[PDB]
Design a protein around this ligand. Structure first.
Ligand SMILES: [Zn+2]
Ligand SMILES: [Zn+2]
Ligand SMILES: [Zn+2]
Lengths: 36, 36, 36
């Protein structure tokens, strides 16, 4: 339905937001290795 | 259209799902280096 | 609104597209370490 699609979009926004945070966390560990 | 937007949302859901799997795969390789 | 949801979806598509590019960039650095 329309309301189901709104909630689906909001959940996907939260998933990309967690995506960015997880990538930053991994970048931090990689950069420690790259300059260590 | 409405139907085009539904399919766009479903494709984006699949893209984030592949996102998570690719990040996990890279985390596995990084963790091997970090503790190796 | 409907138009707000269309723009929200387009912004999320751009965010996953940047997601993929950032993951590839990190994979490149990780692969340098893994075979270095
Ligand atoms: Zn660096
Ligand atoms: Zn570790
Ligand atoms: Zn490799």
């Amino acid at each position: 339905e329309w309301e189901a699609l709104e909630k689906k979009l909001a959940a996907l926004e939260s998933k990309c937001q967690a995506x960015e945070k997880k990538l930053q966390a991994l970048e931090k560990k990689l950069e420690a290795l790259e300059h260590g």
